[PDB]
């Protein structure tokens, strides 16, 4: 969470969220009159895993997303409505993309599953979609895993399966594998 409290109109959406929904009860209106200010009176870091939702709840950009800081403007992004595989809730999300890059992930309204809230992991895991990515087929050799074409990898898999028979073939599915 990035803070520009100078831009803060004193609604209480962040405080009400932190109390009723998040339940960490960290934010409050400290002060009286015009110099009243919003935030933890002590130096504290927001501990809830629903912390990202205050950014969306903030109408006037006083609370903003630090990972998504100064990177793009709203009009530049194409939004596609998809679901979050971070956990089995299947939170409905809108992925905003510029070109070939995912820029930010925000929730969608679905009273059935996620009212309008998104967990921090789902919200901020798009960063790991740009790192340690697999782009090409790799076949192992004496020099290690090396670049190979699709045909060569399939040939190696065929030569391997030829040896195995019956229950010697084993499949392990992952957390993010899809039904198809």
Partner 1 sequence: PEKTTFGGLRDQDRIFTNIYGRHDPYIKGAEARGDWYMTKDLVGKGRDWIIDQIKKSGLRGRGGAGFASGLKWSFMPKVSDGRPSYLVVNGDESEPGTCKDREIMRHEPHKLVEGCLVAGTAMGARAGYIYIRGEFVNERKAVERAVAEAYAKGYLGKNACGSGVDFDLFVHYGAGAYICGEETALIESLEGKQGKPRLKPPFPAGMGLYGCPTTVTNVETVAVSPTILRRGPEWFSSFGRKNNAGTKLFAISGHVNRPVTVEEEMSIPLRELIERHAGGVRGGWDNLLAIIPGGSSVPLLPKKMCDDVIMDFDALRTAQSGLGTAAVIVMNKDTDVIDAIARLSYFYKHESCGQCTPCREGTGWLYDIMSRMRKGDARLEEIDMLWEITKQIEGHTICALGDAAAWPVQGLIRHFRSEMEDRIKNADQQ
CA-based Rg of the chain, rounded to a whole angstrom?
23
Cβ atoms within 10 A of the Cβ of 93, count? 24
Give yes or no for residue 166 binding partner 1 (CB under 8 A). no
Interface positions, 140-169, toward ligand SF4 (CB under 6 A): none
- Options 34, 73, 143, 158; binder of partner 1; rule CB under 8 A: 34
- DSSP state letters, 87-144: STT--EEEEEEETTEEEEEEE---TTS-SS---HHHHHGGGGGSSS---S-EEEETTE
Return the one option of ligand SF4, partner 1, none that residue 67 interacts with (CB less than 5 to 8 A, by type): none
Binding pattern for the stretch 48-87 against ligand SF4, x by CB under 6 A and - elsewhere: ---------xxxx-xx------------------------
Give yes or no for residue 14 binding ligand SF4 (CB under 6 A). yes
Sign of the Cα pseudo-torsion (72, 129, 2, 89, in order) = positive
Stretch that binds partner 1, among 29-37, 39-47, 65-73, 95-103 (CB under 8 A): 29-37
């Amino acid at each position: 969470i990035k803070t520009s409290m100078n831009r803060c109109i004193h609604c209480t959406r962040c405080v009400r969220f932190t109390h009723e929904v998040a339940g960490t009860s960290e934010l409050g209106i400290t002060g009286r009159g015009r110099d009243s200010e919003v935030g933890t009176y002590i130096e504290k870091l927001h501990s809830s895993e629903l912390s990202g939702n205050v950014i969306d709840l903030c109408p006037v950009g006083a609370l903003l997303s630090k990972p998504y800081a100064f990177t793009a403007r709203s009009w530049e992004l194409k939004g596609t409505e998809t679901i979050d595989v971070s956990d089995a809730l299947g939170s409905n999300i809108k992925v905003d993309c510029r070109g070939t890059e995912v820029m930010r992930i925000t929730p969608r309204l679905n009273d059935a599953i996620n009212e309008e809230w998104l967990s921090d992991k789902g919200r901020f895991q798009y960063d790991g979609l740009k790192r340690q990515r697999l782009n090409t087929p790799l076949v192992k050799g004496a020099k290690g895993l090396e670049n190979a074409t699709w045909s060569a990898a399939f040939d190696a898999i065929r030569t391997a399966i030829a040896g195995a028979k019956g229950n010697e073939l084993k499949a392990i599915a992952g957390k993010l594998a899809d039904a198809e």
